[PDB]
A = this chain, B = another copy of it.
C-alpha cells in the first residue's frame, strides 16, 4: 500500500488451491465471479467442507455408539480451553475481516468523492463558460456596437470559451463509475454488517454453550448435559458451515488478489478507456498523463481569455463609462475558472486514485484474507472443541 501491490504468500498459496468444478473437471482459476465454471469450483470447495462435516458427524455417532454399547474432567477442561482459544481467534479474525471490509468501503468512498468532484468541476466550468460568458459577452456586444476591434475581441473570447468547452467535454464522464462505486459500497456495508453480527452471535453462542456445559458438569445435571450435547451438535453444524464459507471466500479473494489489475481492466472495459484505467492503475512516474494535453489547452485558453479581457478593460473602460461591470464579471469568472482548473488538474492526477486503489487492495487482500483465514481457524477449532466435548459426553454420563 506504500509503493505497489505484490501478492502475499498466503494469497499465492490460496490461489494455488486446485479449482475442480462439481464433476472433478479442471476449472480455470482466474477470478470470474460471473462465470458458471468458477462459481461451480467455489461450490465444490463448499461441498468438500460439507463432506468433511458429514465425516465428523459419522465419526461422532460411531464413537457414541461404541462407548454406550461397549479423564472426563480433564477432557472437559481441554475442550473448554480449545473453545476459548477458538473464540479468541474468531474475535480476532472477525475484527480483521471487518477492518478489511471497512478499508475497501473507505477506498470506494474516496474514489467516489474524487470522481464526483471531477464531474462537478467539469459540469460547473462548462455551464459557467457557456451560459455566463455568453450572457456577459452579449451584453458587452450590445453596449459596444460601435467598435469593430472590440467586437472582434469579444468574438475571440467566445471562440476561446468554445475551445474550453470542447476540451472539457473531451474528459471522461464518471457518472456510471460513480453509481457503480456507490452501489458496491452500499452492498459491502450491508453484507459486512450482517457477517460481523452473525460471527459475533456465533462466538457468544459458543461461549455460552461451553460455560453451560461446564456448569452442568459441575452440578451433575443430566438435563444440562443433554441440552449442551444438543447445542454442541448444532454449533458443530454451524462451525462446519462457517468453515465452508470462509474457505470458499478465501479462495475467491485469493483468486482476485493474485491479479487485481487484470480483473479491473477486464470488468471496466467499455465504460472506461484503457489508457485512463491504466493511468490510474499503474501511476508510473515516468509516464504521460492522458489529460495533460486537455489541461494544457484549457489553461492556454483561459490565459488568452484573461489577456483579452484585461486589454479590453484597460482600453475601453476609460472610453466607455459603463460596461465595466460586465468586464469585471468576466474577469471574476475567469479567476474562478483558473481556480477550478487547478483543482481539476489536482483531482485527475493518478496519485490519489492509485492510492485509493492500493488501499483497497491492501484492505481486501491483507486484512480481509487474513481475517477469513482466522475465521476458518476459529471454525476448525470450534469443530474440534465441540467434537471432543461430545466424545467425552458418554464418559461423563457414566461417571
Q: Give A contacts to B, CB under 8 Å.
A: 1-2, 74, 77, 81, 84, 87-88, 91-92, 95, 99, 106, 109-110, 214, 218, 285, 288-289, 292, 295-296, 299-300, 303, 338-339, 342-343, 345-347, 349, 351-352, 355
Query: Shortest CB–CB separation between residue A79 and chain B, in angstroms?
Result: 14
Q: Which residues of B contact A88 (CB under 8 A)?
A: 84, 87-88, 91
Main SS at interface, chain A: helix
Q: Once bound together, how far apart are the Cα atoms of A351 and B356, in whole Å?
A: 13
Contact A346 B339 (CB under 8 A): no
Q: Which residues of B contact A2 (CB under 8 A)?
A: 106, 109-110
Q: A2-B106, A92-B95, A99-B99 are in contact. Are A351 and B346 (CB under 8 A)?
A: yes
Contact A303 B299 (CB under 8 A): yes
Q: Once bound together, how far apart are the Cα atoms of A222 and B355, in whole Å?
A: 60
Contact A292 B346 (CB under 8 A): no
Contact A342 B92 (CB under 8 A): no
Q: Which residues of B contact A95 (CB under 8 A)?
A: 92, 95
Q: Once bound together, how far apart are the Cα atoms of A338 and B88, in whole Å?
A: 56
Q: Once bound together, how far apart are the Cα atoms of A140 and B77, in whole Å?
A: 90
Q: Which residues of B contact A349 (CB under 8 A)?
A: 342-343, 346
Q: List 12 A-B contacts (CB under 8 A).
A: A81-B84, A84-B84, A88-B88, A91-B92, A292-B339, A292-B342, A295-B342, A296-B338, A303-B303, A343-B349, A345-B345, A352-B355
Q: Once bound together, how far apart are the Cα atoms of A292 and B12, in whole Å?
A: 47
Q: Once bound together, how far apart are the Cα atoms of A352 and B214, in whole Å?
A: 55
Q: Which residues of B contact A355 (CB under 8 A)?
A: 110, 352
Contact B1 A106 (CB under 8 A): yes
